[PDB]
Amino acid sequence: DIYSRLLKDRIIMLGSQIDDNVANSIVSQLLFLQAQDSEKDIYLYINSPGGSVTAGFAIYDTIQHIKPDVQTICIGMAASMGSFLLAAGAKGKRFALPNAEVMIHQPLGGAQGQATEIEIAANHILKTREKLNRILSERTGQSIEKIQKDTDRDNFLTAEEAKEYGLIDEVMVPETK
Amino acid sequence: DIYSRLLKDRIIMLGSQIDDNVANSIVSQLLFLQAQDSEKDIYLYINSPGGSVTAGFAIYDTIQHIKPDVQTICIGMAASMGSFLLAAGAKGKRFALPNAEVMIHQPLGGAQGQATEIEIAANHILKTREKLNRILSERTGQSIEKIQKDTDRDNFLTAEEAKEYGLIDEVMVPETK
Amino acid sequence: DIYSRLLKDRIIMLGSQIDDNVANSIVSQLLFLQAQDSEKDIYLYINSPGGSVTAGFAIYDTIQHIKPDVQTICIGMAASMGSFLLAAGAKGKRFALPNAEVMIHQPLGGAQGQATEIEIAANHILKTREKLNRILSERTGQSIEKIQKDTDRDNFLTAEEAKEYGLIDEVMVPETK
Amino acid sequence: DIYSRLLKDRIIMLGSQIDDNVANSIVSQLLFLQAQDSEKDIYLYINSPGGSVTAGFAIYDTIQHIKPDVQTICIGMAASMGSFLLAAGAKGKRFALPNAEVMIHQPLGGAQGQATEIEIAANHILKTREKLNRILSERTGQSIEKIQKDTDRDNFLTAEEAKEYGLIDEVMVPETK
Amino acid sequence: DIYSRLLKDRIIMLGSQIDDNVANSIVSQLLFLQAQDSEKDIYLYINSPGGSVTAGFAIYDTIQHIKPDVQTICIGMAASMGSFLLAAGAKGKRFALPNAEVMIHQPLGGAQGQATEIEIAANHILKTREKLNRILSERTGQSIEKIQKDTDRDNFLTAEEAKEYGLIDEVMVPETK
Amino acid sequence: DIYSRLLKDRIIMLGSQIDDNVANSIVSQLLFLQAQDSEKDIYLYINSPGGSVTAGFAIYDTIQHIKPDVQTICIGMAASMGSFLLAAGAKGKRFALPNAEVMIHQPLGGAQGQATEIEIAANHILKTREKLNRILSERTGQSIEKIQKDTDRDNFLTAEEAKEYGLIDEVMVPETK
Amino acid sequence: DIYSRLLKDRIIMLGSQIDDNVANSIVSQLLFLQAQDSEKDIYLYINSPGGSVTAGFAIYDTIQHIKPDVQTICIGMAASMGSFLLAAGAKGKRFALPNAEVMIHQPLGGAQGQATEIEIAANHILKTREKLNRILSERTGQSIEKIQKDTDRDNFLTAEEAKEYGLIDEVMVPETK
Amino acid sequence: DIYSRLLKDRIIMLGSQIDDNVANSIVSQLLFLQAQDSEKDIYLYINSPGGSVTAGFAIYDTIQHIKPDVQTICIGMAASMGSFLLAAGAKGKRFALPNAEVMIHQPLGGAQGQATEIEIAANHILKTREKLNRILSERTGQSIEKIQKDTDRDNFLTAEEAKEYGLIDEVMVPETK
Amino acid sequence: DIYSRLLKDRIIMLGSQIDDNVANSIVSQLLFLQAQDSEKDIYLYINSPGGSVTAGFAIYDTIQHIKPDVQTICIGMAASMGSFLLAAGAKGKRFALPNAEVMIHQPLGGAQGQATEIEIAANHILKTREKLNRILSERTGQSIEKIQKDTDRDNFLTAEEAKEYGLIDEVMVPETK
Ligand SMILES: CC(C)C[C@H](NC(=O)[C@H](Cc1c[nH]c2ccccc12)NC(=O)c1cc(Cl)ccc1Cl)B(O)O
Ligand SMILES: CC(C)C[C@H](NC(=O)[C@H](Cc1c[nH]c2ccccc12)NC(=O)c1cc(Cl)ccc1Cl)B(O)O
Ligand SMILES: CC(C)C[C@H](NC(=O)[C@H](Cc1c[nH]c2ccccc12)NC(=O)c1cc(Cl)ccc1Cl)B(O)O
Ligand SMILES: CC(C)C[C@H](NC(=O)[C@H](Cc1c[nH]c2ccccc12)NC(=O)c1cc(Cl)ccc1Cl)B(O)O
Ligand SMILES: CC(C)C[C@H](NC(=O)[C@H](Cc1c[nH]c2ccccc12)NC(=O)c1cc(Cl)ccc1Cl)B(O)O
Ligand SMILES: CC(C)C[C@H](NC(=O)[C@H](Cc1c[nH]c2ccccc12)NC(=O)c1cc(Cl)ccc1Cl)B(O)O
Ligand SMILES: CC(C)C[C@H](NC(=O)[C@H](Cc1c[nH]c2ccccc12)NC(=O)c1cc(Cl)ccc1Cl)B(O)O
Ligand SMILES: CC(C)C[C@H](NC(=O)[C@H](Cc1c[nH]c2ccccc12)NC(=O)c1cc(Cl)ccc1Cl)B(O)O
Ligand SMILES: CC(C)C[C@H](NC(=O)[C@H](Cc1c[nH]c2ccccc12)NC(=O)c1cc(Cl)ccc1Cl)B(O)O
């Protein structure tokens, strides 16, 4: 209704910025679908400009953790945290529509206060970047140094280039649902 | 609905800042579940950057007060009051997902007025800090003096570090709901 | 729902500032529960930073007026008008959770206009303070003179200190709902 | 619900400023309860700081018009138009709770524009004052001159003094609903 | 400079709204010019949309009081208080340029607060209107009831109609300074 | 300085919107230059988008009243009241530079209040429009009816079109000062 | 310049609200004139709607303190602190122009904070009102209780009424500088 | 000019809040006057509602440091830091005009940030209070414990009470400059 | 004037936050006093809450560069960069008045953008901190580690403690200019 009816078909729509509210809703729907049936696939549609790293990791870890395969399907755009969750779907079941776009880039943040507070914030966001680089590296088959170089600034990829990159497994063609 | 549906499985989702409204909601849900069944465990997911000390304590004392064990599960991030409540779960039943982050730091506040009013407010927040340090020492095994030094500035912990710190008992591995 | 299902258990949640809207809601629930059953206790949980004196008195006089005993349970914080209503529960049925805070202080207000109007507002808030002191004297056993001195500025009390002051009867211990 | 449930016991809750929207709701509820039963009393609880004179008169005249007796019960504060509606209840059935506050004062207003516009607005509010004094006189037994003098500035009354004045008939004592 | 140079020729320019600042400056210039020479005429140019009644009366009474004849010359527009000061120049020496405009209308004000404060405000602005009607009546040769009727709303007069009205003595024609 | 130094050359610069302050300055400069010499020409440069009708008539009538010829020279733009004041210069001495623009249109205004107030304001602005049409008719040799039609909406003219219209006498050619 | 030239004639223009800056300016001018000549009178024109009590008292006591007589001359309006200073001129040398208005009323202020702070502010402004009443009684010949009643609300006086009240000595007539 | 011409008479005017800008001006004037003449008295008039403690101490220490005696004359009001500087003038040369007010109270401030920053700010402002109490003790002959209690809240003093307190030496009486 | 005349006594007044405008002014005054005379001492008064590090370094290095000794005199408060410039005065000629305040603390900053930008900003302010510690160490005789530890949070010092610390050479006593 309309999402509630698609939920009955094990479909979840991720169609916005990823903040704490959106993460909790997505995680709750993943938990629910598994409680309903722990074997059948889940279908996660992603059209998102990104969002918070920790909200993204709530979703990522919940995907990794439950028993069902979570298929990921990029429609429109999956950028930043959105392309991270796209790459998080079950290997072999990560898709993009032919004109969907994918963007990857390094994390952003802020820091204010005493020199020692700024340095704690700096160190924390550097450690977070290395963790993201490492995980995306394992999700894509790329080296860590390739991820670091390719995310230094915004890096826009077509569906076909995202497949060659390893972020998705197949570009979805029409005539099938 | 979707949280109403998870509530039938005795799951509470704490996914935001902890203000007085959030705290009454969590407290009410804790009371509701005990009233339906005072023996079965409750599952409290925490994704929270923290919030008010007194709202936190409404949740904390209610967790300790009811008969059911309250399992705490950190997804994404438990910072500040979020990690105090994470530590507050039933011992042996405090978890974090593998990429969740935990952060601890001393309390923050504000004071304006006459010198004597500012002294009253300084004395109250120092006493609040001694009360928080004492309870976290009891919950983790760290000494009060170590809690004091370790919370002087922001202190970010991975899941495994939260385990060794004593804030949780196990890092959750996948292949199990 | 969630408060509605707790209502069925004769539980009323007071978890915000006390204004006219909040007071009207709490009086109604009290009135409602007496109509349902005039003998069975009511349970009033208090987490409030205070609020309006006249709205508080609407709750106070309604609590004293109905037949059911109204138990007061402080979770988190009962400050200012919050702690006055905490002290207003049936004697022997006024509680605080072990880490809840209680605070008492004199009333605050404002006045603007002609010298004559400022005098009228000052006289009114002073008489209101004497009325509050007299009632709190009756509820706690402390003398009016001691309440006057102890509320001159903000006075924060632990649960145990609130018991020795007479604001509550017991600190509630765990292992019981 | 919660007010709908109490309306089935012929209770109406007036707990805000009296404006046009509030007056329509109160008038409607009065009209509705008469329609259901034109003989049984109605219970109007009043916790109001006052409000619009014409909105107040919509309520006042509806109280006088309908067949049922309308008991007024002051909880918290009946100020300005609030206290006028308090005096409007059926004689013998006008109550205040022991610590409720009653306030009377003359009407306030504003005028802007040409001198003749300002004169028209002044004459209208002076006439309105004489109408209100004349009615409060019939309702209380005080003379118009005494009302005139006693409302020149804000006049705060305890529940007992409001009884001595004629605004209410009885202070309500406990051990009864 | 440029006004200071014209001041040496005994010319004052009133070219703005009449507030207390402007009145103080015009009055100071009148006092100065008389101090320089108490017998030669002064030339007051008026282009003004009006302003405060009391600021206007500061200027009016200073014109009436000093020894020199004050000639008044309307250029552009003299409305409200501006047409009052125009009519206040020495009889026989009040002028308008051929296309200048004159407007007369009743005073405007505001009033807020208690009925008795609004009535004092109304009474004062009505007495002020009668005083203005009376003085303008004597300046123009019209009856008081004619002034009252013609100022009920905004009343725009050409220079020629201002001369027939009595507000000015001659329409100034060209080829002279 | 630098305008003050052009003043000693009998040059006035009108380079902005015409309000009461600007009219005051221009009138004062006109009075001042006649004071210095009643015979020699004045030179009024006009680059103005227009402005207030009454402020414009203060300048217009002062131009007409004084003894010296006032030459008018359009540089850049003379629109609305600016082109009215361009046409006001001494006949035979009204100029535009080759690329100057002139614009004529009917007056604009506003009104709010009671129907009879709106009628007073409408009648006043229609009457002002007939006065402006008649003066421009005398200044240009065009008939009032043709002014009426040609000003119904914004009517932009080149310098050559303004000379054919009668608004200026000559388009000023270079090689002279 | 223009006030600097008038200061050469020992004239001070008080033409605005009385705030601390205005008061320091007036006080400095008073001291300046005494320093040039401690024997010749000073002329203080007052057109003022009032202002701060303590800034008024800085002017007042300085007027009383210096050797020169200070003549007070009301043009336009002396209201509130303005009429207190008018009354403060050297006896026999307090004037108003014939259409000047004088207004007297009780002081206004504001208080917010704790009951005891509001009591302190109420007490200070009542004692300030008794001080102002006592001095106005001495300057006018009215008894303190008549001042008290007459300033309860705004009390507008003509020049002749201000003379009969004792606030000035003479109404100024024309034909004299 | 006007303050400039008073400066030549060794008169300094302190008539506003005391911030760094004001303090820098007053210190400069004091330094300047000492350079001109190290032996002749300086006259410092005070009409100030107070201001910053450190800016005040910049003025205070400069007054004690220079050779010339600095007379302090309170006109209007010396409150807070204003009354501290009043008490700082050369003993026997500290004055108030008869209707000037004096007010003393404890310092006010604000703190925001971590618990340990709030503690640092509280300790600082308390130490500052003790330093001010000790110095006022020396300036007035009152004990520290009596200043502590008498400044707990706003303490308004007449000129006569300020003399009995020791804040000034004499009330200045008229017929002397 | 008043600062221009003090400048002829080779005095400079630093009495505000230190930004680029203030630094340019101070640097220029130093450059100008050296131009006038390269041997006579300069007197820099400091009442500053601090400000920009690079602005302060513009002043610091100019003090070190010019020929004359630059004496520094703390009046009121030298905080942050203020206390750094205080220590920058010629050794043996760094003073504080007896009640002046000195405060030292570490630098503060802000950073926003990509992780690599935040790292660049953190490294730059850490390097700035080591530079400031190193200079203050040479200026005071304290070790860098002690400076480091003593500036971790705001550190307030009396004038006497600033002497003991090595920020100044003497506390200035009175009876001397
Ligand atoms: C690279 C990609 C996989 C993730 C991107 N998200 C981010 O880069 C980071 C989240 C983050 C990590 N460490 C931080 C330290 C301080 C602040 C924020 C952060 N933050 C934001 O976007 C952001 C920043 C602010 Cl200040 C407020 C709200 C948000 Cl949501 B993306 O664009 O989806
Ligand atoms: C250490 C950790 C377990 C708690 C942290 N919470 C806090 O530190 C404190 C709550 C508090 C305790 N005593 C106070 C005295 C004055 C003001 C606030 C407080 N306050 C805030 O956070 C805050 C502050 C303001 Cl002004 C407004 C709203 C909030 Cl909610 B965290 O970050 O979760
Ligand atoms: C001591 C304790 C038991 C009560 C405290 N409440 C109060 O002190 C008083 C209510 C009151 C009584 N007499 C008044 C006269 C004028 C204005 C307000 C009041 N007022 C406020 O709090 C307040 C004040 C304003 Cl201006 C606006 C909104 C509110 Cl709600 B606490 O903090 O709970
Ligand atoms: C004496 C008592 C029984 C009633 C009081 N109500 C009033 O005095 C009057 C209503 C009124 C009557 N004649 C008027 C003429 C002009 C404007 C308002 C009015 N007005 C307000 O209250 C008010 C005023 C404004 Cl401007 C805006 C909104 C409101 Cl709601 B009380 O305080 O309950
Ligand atoms: C008829 C004509 C000769 C004068 C006109 N002036 C006025 O009508 C009156 C001044 C006045 C007299 N008694 C009052 C009572 C209350 C308020 C204002 C007034 N007031 C304003 O214009 C106005 C009003 C406000 Cl609220 C603020 C600023 C101003 Cl300046 B005109 O248009 O020149
Ligand atoms: C045809 C040409 C020679 C004049 C044009 N000026 C105008 O048309 C008129 C001035 C005017 C006359 N009678 C009025 C009645 C009500 C309001 C304004 C007016 N008004 C404005 O321009 C305007 C309008 C407002 Cl609402 C505010 C400020 C101004 Cl200045 B032009 O464009 O130079
Ligand atoms: C009766 C007559 C001779 C004086 C009148 N002045 C006043 O009545 C009083 C000054 C005053 C005395 N005790 C106070 C306590 C609190 C606040 C203000 C005051 N205050 C204001 O007017 C006002 C009020 C505020 Cl909040 C701010 C700025 C001002 Cl300037 B009048 O109208 O000239
Ligand atoms: C008792 C009397 C002799 C002085 C009073 N001044 C003060 O009490 C203090 C100054 C001060 C001392 N230690 C502080 C610590 C933190 C902040 C301020 C301070 N502060 C203010 O006044 C204030 C406060 C703020 Cl937040 C902003 C601007 C100012 Cl200027 B009075 O009223 O003259
Ligand atoms: C330790 C002491 C000797 C100096 C202190 N000054 C500072 O700490 C630093 C200046 C600075 C150095 N490196 C930076 C990197 C990023 C931003 C600012 C800085 N910055 C501010 O003060 C500040 C900060 C902002 Cl964001 C805006 C305006 C200012 Cl002016 B103090 O308090 O005098």
Annotation says A105 is catalytic: yes
Chain D residues within 8 Å of chain C (Cβ atoms)? 2-3, 5-6, 9, 11, 13, 15-16, 45, 47-49, 75-77, 97-101, 153-154, 156, 172, 174-177
The answer to whether the CB atoms of H65 and I174 lie below 8 A apart is yes
Q: How far is it, in rounded angstroms, from Cα C81 to Cα C87?
A: 10
I130: Cβ contacts below 8 Å, ≥ 6 apart: I144
In degrees and rounded to multiples of 5, residue A11 shows phi and psi of: -105, 130
Catalytic residues of I: 80, 105
Pairing of the two strands F94-96 and F42-48: unpaired
Q: How far is it, in rounded angstroms, from Cα I47 to Cα H58?
A: 8
DSSP letter string, E60-117: HHHHHHSSS-EEEEEEEEEETHHHHHHTTSPTT-EEE-TT-EEEE---EEEEEEEHHH
Residue C111: Cβ within 10 Å count: 20
3-class secondary structure, H96: strand
Residue C113: Cβ within 10 Å count: 17
3-class secondary structure, C99: coil
Amino acid letter at G115?
A: A
Q: Do C99 and B131 contact (CB within 8 A), yes or no?
A: yes
Detail the DSSP E strand segments found in chain A. 11-14, 42-48, 70-79, 94-96, 101-104, 108-114, 155-158, 170-171
Chain B residues whose beta carbon lies within 8 Å of the beta carbon of residue A116? 153
Apex CA C10: angle with CA C5 and CA C16, to 5°? 80
Q: Where are the alpha helices (DSSP H) in chain I?
A: 3-7, 20-36, 53-65, 81-87, 115-140, 144-150, 159-165
F to C contact (≥3 Cβ pairs closer than 8 Å): no
Residue B5 half-sphere exposure, CB side, CA atoms within 13 Å? 14
Q: Is the peptide bond before D144 cis (omega within 30 degrees of 0)?
A: no
3-class secondary structure, H92: coil
The technique by which this structure was obtained is X-ray
Q: Nearest bound ligand to CA C79?
A: 3
Distance (Å) from the alpha carbon of C133 to chain G's nearest alpha carbon: 13
Termini Cα distance of chain A: 20
Q: How far is it, in rounded angstroms, from Cα H71 to Cα H92?
A: 9
3-class secondary structure, F105: coil
Of B54, B62, B121, the CB nearest to C77: B54
Distance (Å) from the alpha carbon of B104 to chain H's nearest alpha carbon: 13
Q: How far is it, in rounded angstroms, from Cα I44 to Cα B54?
A: 51
Termini Cα distance of chain D: 20
- Secondary-structure percent of chain B, ordered helix, strand, coil, rounded to 5: 45, 25, 30
Burial class of residue H140 in the structure, from the number of CB atoms within 10 Å of its CB (0-12 exposed, 13-18 middle, 19+ buried) = middle
Q: How far is it, in rounded angstroms, from Cα A55 to Cα A47?
A: 16
Breaks (C-N over 2.5 A) in chain A follow: none
Of G9, G47, G172, the CB nearest to E65: G172
Report the sign of the C-alpha dihedral through residues D118, D121, D127, D132, in that order: negative
Q: Do E82 and E49 contact (CB within 8 A), yes or no?
A: yes
Chain B residues within 8 Å of chain A (Cβ atoms)? 2-3, 5-6, 9, 11, 13, 15-16, 45, 47-49, 75-77, 97-101, 153-154, 156, 172, 174-177
Q: Do A124 and I119 contact (CB within 8 A), yes or no?
A: no
Termini Cα distance of chain H: 20
- Secondary-structure percent of chain C, ordered helix, strand, coil, rounded to 5: 45, 25, 30
- The partner residues of C45 in beta bridges, in order of sequence, read C13, C73
Q: Where are the alpha helices (DSSP H) in chain C?
A: 3-8, 20-36, 53-65, 81-86, 115-140, 144-150, 159-165
Segment holding H170, helix H or strand E: strand H170-171
Q: How far is it, in rounded angstroms, from Cα D152 to Cα D141?
A: 18
Q: How far is it, in rounded angstroms, from Cα E121 to Cα E108?
A: 12
Residue from I52, I103, I118 whose mutation best tests the ligand 9 pocket (most atoms within 8 A of CB):
I52
Segment holding H63, helix H or strand E: helix H53-65
Segment holding H156, helix H or strand E: strand H155-157
Q: Do B60 and B88 contact (CB within 8 A), yes or no?
A: yes
Q: Do A107 and A135 contact (CB within 8 A), yes or no?
A: no
Dmax of chain D from CA atoms?
Answer: 59
Q: How far is it, in rounded angstroms, from Cα D101 to Cα C131?
A: 11
Annotation says E80 is catalytic: yes
- The partner residues of D107 in beta bridges, in order of sequence, read none
Indicate the domain borders of chain A.
1-177
Pairing of the two strands B42-48 and B70-79: parallel
Chain E residues whose beta carbon lies within 8 Å of the beta carbon of residue D124? none
Detail the DSSP E strand segments found in D15-100. 42-48, 70-79, 94-96
Residue E9 half-sphere exposure, CB side, CA atoms within 13 Å? 19
3-class secondary structure, A22: helix
| Size (chain I), residues | 177
- The partner residues of F94 in beta bridges, in order of sequence, read F72
The answer to whether the CB atoms of E174 and F65 lie below 8 A apart is yes
Q: Is the peptide bond before D147 cis (omega within 30 degrees of 0)?
A: no
Q: How far, CA to CA in Å, does H97 sit from each of D146, E85, G62, H72?
A: 46, 43, 8, 11
Nearest to A17 by CA among A41, A60, A37, A46: A46
Apex CA H84: angle with CA H80 and CA H85, to 5°? 120
- Residue G176 zone, left/alpha/beta (φ > 0; ψ -120 to 50; rest): beta
C7: Cβ contacts below 8 Å, ≥ 6 apart: C29, C32, C33
A22: Cβ contacts below 8 Å, ≥ 6 apart: A14, A16, A51, A55
Q: How far is it, in rounded angstroms, from Cα D77 to Cα D96?
A: 9
3-class secondary structure, C55: helix
Of B21, B58, B120, the CB nearest to C75: B58
Distance (Å) from the alpha carbon of D25 to chain C's nearest alpha carbon: 15
Burial class of residue F64 in the structure, from the number of CB atoms within 10 Å of its CB (0-12 exposed, 13-18 middle, 19+ buried) = middle
Residue B104 half-sphere exposure, CB side, CA atoms within 13 Å? 26
Q: How far, CA to CA in Å, does B115 sit from each of B122, B168, H106, I157?
A: 10, 41, 7, 19
- What resolution, expressed in A, was reported for this entry? 2.3
- Distance (angstroms) between ligand 3 centre and the Cα of B18 equals 26
Query: What's CA B150's distance to the chain center, in Å?
Result: 17
Q: Which two tokens stand for residue I138?
A: 């040479």
Termini Cα distance of chain C: 20
Nearest to E96 by CA among E163, E42, E36: E163
Q: How far is it, in rounded angstroms, from Cα G46 to Cα G48?
A: 6
Q: How far is it, in rounded angstroms, from Cα I84 to Cα I86?
A: 5
Residue from C57, C104, C108 whose mutation best tests the ligand 3 pocket (most atoms within 8 A of CB):
C108
Catalytic residues of H: 80, 105
Amino acid letter at A167?
A: L
Residue G84: Cβ within 10 Å count: 23
F80: Cβ contacts below 8 Å, ≥ 6 apart: F49, F50, F51, F103, F104, F105
Residue B166: Cβ within 10 Å count: 16
Q: How far is it, in rounded angstroms, from Cα I86 to Cα H131?
A: 23
Distance (Å) from the alpha carbon of E76 to chain F's nearest alpha carbon: 4
Q: Do A96 and A72 contact (CB within 8 A), yes or no?
A: no
- Distance (angstroms) between ligand 3 centre and the Cα of C110 equals 9
Q: How far is it, in rounded angstroms, from Cα A68 to Cα A72?
A: 12
Tokens 């200079």, located at residue: I135
I to C contact (≥3 Cβ pairs closer than 8 Å): no
